[PDB]
């Protein structure tokens, strides 16, 4: 066949989710329908499937691909962990539903690295990201090799810093500075917004976080006072993918038609559209 | 058994020298100390194309021997012999169309790998596999210091006059990319008015006050920023791609290079290749 289901997470301005009007039950203007499973109580796992409105950078992407390599979908969105993390040798989130055959591709902020490329398949990078770090402005520190990240207690008071756990980002601190990692934990952070509300007020000193997420957050920071260091700087340089099964047929063609929106410009706009900030 | 690379003589990824007059590389040194890896490479220097063994190092070259021991292989290198990245032009008589430069040799099998920077773009990839990208690159603007230029949606670029000039190389890349897309007619129609025959003359008028800006690879432009320190880049990157390693369809290496990839991007080797090789 060629109607999809497809995964999703939320995470602006890759993609927003919107409840759909009330009186319609329709998806109208640039965003698309999405389903999100919801429980009823929490002593069973009987639930719902809510219809929802899904837009952004990662949807306009899904709406073209749709269109040129020709298949339809059943968009949703996970509920079973986020990004996707090996948990007991489980995989979770958009990876996990993938890997699990619920999927045949998840789109969204999904960051490319090894690890998951030996369990998906991924397409061609359409975003750079990587890892970046923000800070209240005037807050010195020269990148994550900086001595305040990788010994903190050499300092006091310690350096405040941490990430939003069990994605790419941590994946890879815990890979490269266990003593970083170990320390960092306890500056955990439930969301991005969370931390930047830490960093704006002096209870965190820097953020560590998905490059690309962190430097449209900076664009629109309200006065301008939280930024990226060097400047944009981006470390572990990758990029966000589709993921596709193992051996999935869609791979090629998926990969030829994202070129195919760099080569035409389409990427470039798309990316002004959506990613755009005030500040600089 | 032996991997036959190709590559090009495209500065700061793959420098060329002459050997010494004993036939041997020149011992030299990194900024950071470490001594420079060196190969020999063979190459010529309507002419005839006297192969030669030349001296190669650089960005590329320090990848390719980190693959090489990565993954097992031995490899012999040589310099494309037409000098050319690779386009697809018309036979004579308007038969076919054939790839000529570093894509010629790749498919003709005169070599097994395209280790150079290499923008991965769709016509390509309908032809060849590419790695993940080795290096997120893009365009950006070379401006006298002091010179205000927020990219390509700058008021100078989308108005253009003569008193503030720019331009890129004659029938480059970017010269032809400019020409495909009809939102950049207005811009393209000055840039014909003054493109430049090579990137070091046309950064030479940026110094002489005869061009205002130079349009070109983001790699090239930092890496010209580091040594002449009366220019600078400015602006937001744009038309963003990456250089990818470029095999034959179904080759057995392309899973492991690209893996290889992502682990020395994730492992903070390819960061430390930027800093000795194209920042300073
Ligand atoms: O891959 C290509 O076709 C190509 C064309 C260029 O002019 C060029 C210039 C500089 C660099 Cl670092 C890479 C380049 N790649
Ligand atoms: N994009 C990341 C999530 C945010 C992060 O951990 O930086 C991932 O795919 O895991």
């Given at each position: 066949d060629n109607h999809l289901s497809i995964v999703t997470l939320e995470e602006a301005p890759f993609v927003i989710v919107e409840d759909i009007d009330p009186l319609t039950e329709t998806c109208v203007r640039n965003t698309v329908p999405c389903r999100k499973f919801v429980k009823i109580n929490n002593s069973t796992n009987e639930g719902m499937n809510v219809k929802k409105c899904c837009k952004?950078?990662?949807?306009?992407?899904?709406?073209?691909?749709?269109?040129?390599?020709?298949?339809?979908?059943?968009?949703?969105?996970?509920?079973?962990?986020?990004?996707?993390?090996?948990?007991?040798?489980?995989?979770?989130?958009?990876?996990?539903?993938?890997?699990?055959?619920?999927?045949v591709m998840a789109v969204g902020s999904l960051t490319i690295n090894e690890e998951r490329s030996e369990v998906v398949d991924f397409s061609v990078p359409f975003?750079?990201?990587?890892?970046?770090?923000?800070?209240?402005?005037?807050?010195?520190?020269?990148?994550l090799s900086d001595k305040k990240f990788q010994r903190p207690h050499d300092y006091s008071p310690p350096f405040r810093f941490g990430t939003v756990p069990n994605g790419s980002t941590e994946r890879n601190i815990r890979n490269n500075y266990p003593y970083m990692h170990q320390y960092m934990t306890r500056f955990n952070q439930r969301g991005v917004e969370d931390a930047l509300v830490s960093l704006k007020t002096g209870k965190l000193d820097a953020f560590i976080y998905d490059?690309?997420?962190?430097?449209?957050?900076?664009?629109?920071?309200?006065?301008?006072?939280?930024?990226?260091?060097?400047?944009?700087?981006?470390?572990?340089?990758?990029?966000?993918?589709?993921?596709?099964?193992?051996?999935?047929?869609?791979?090629?063609?998926?990969?030829?038609?994202?070129?195919?929106?760099?080569?035409?410009?389409?990427?470039?706009?798309?990316?002004?559209?959506?990613?755009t900030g005030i500040c600089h | 058994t032996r991997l036959k690379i190709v590559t090009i003589h495209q500065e700061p990824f793959v420098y060329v020298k002459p050997t010494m007059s004993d036939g041997t590389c020149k011992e030299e040194f990194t900024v950071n100390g470490d001594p420079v890896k060196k190969v020999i490479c063979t190459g010529p220097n309507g002419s005839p194309r006297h192969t030669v063994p030349q001296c190669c190092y650089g960005f590329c070259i320090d990848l390719l021997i980190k693959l090489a021991r990565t993954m097992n292989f031995t490899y012999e290198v040589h310099l494309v012999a037409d000098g050319k990245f690779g386009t697809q032009e018309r036979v004579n008589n308007s038969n076919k169309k054939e790839w000529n430069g570093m894509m010629g040799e790749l498919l003709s099998g005169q070599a097994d790998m395209i280790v150079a920077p290499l923008t991965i773009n769709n016509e390509r990839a309908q032809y060849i596999e590419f790695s993940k990208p080795f290096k997120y690159?893009?365009?950006?603007?070379?401006?006298?210091?002091?010179?205000?230029?927020?990219?390509?949606?700058?008021?100078?670029?989308?108005?253009?006059?003569?008193?503030?000039?720019?331009?890129?190389?004659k029938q480059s890349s970017v010269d032809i990319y400019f020409r495909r897309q009809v939102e950049l007619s207005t811009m393209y129609r000055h840039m014909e008015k003054h493109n430049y025959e090579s990137a070091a003359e046309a950064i030479q008028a940026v110094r002489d006050n005869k061009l205002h800006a130079f349009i070109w690879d983001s790699a090239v432009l930092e890496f010209e920023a580091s040594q002449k320190c009366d220019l600078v880049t400015t602006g937001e990157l744009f038309f963003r791609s990456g250089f990818g390693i470029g095999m034959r369809k179904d080759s057995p290496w392309k899973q492991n290079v690209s893996l290889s990839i992502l682990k020395s991007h994730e492992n903070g080797f390819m960061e430390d290749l930027d800093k000795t090789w194209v920042r300073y």
């Open positions: 952004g950078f990662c949807i306009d992407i899904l709406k073209k691909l749709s269109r040129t390599v020709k298949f339809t979908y059943d968009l949703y969105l996970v509920t079973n962990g986020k990004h996707g993390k090996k948990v007991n040798n489980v995989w979770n989130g958009m990876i996990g539903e993938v890997v699990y055959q619920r999927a975003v750079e990201t990587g890892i970046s770090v923000m800070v209240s402005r005037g807050t010195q520190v020269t990148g490059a690309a997420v962190l430097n449209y957050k900076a664009g629109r920071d309200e006065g301008c006072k939280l930024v990226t260091i060097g400047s944009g700087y981006i470390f572990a340089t990758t990029g966000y993918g589709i993921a596709l099964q193992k051996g999935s047929p869609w791979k090629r063609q998926i990969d030829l038609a994202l070129l195919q929106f760099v080569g035409d410009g389409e990427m470039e706009e798309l990316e002004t559209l959506w990613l | 690159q893009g365009l950006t603007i070379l401006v006298k210091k002091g010179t205000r230029i927020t990219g390509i949606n700058d008021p100078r670029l989308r108005n253009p006059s003569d008193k503030f000039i720019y331009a890129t190389v």
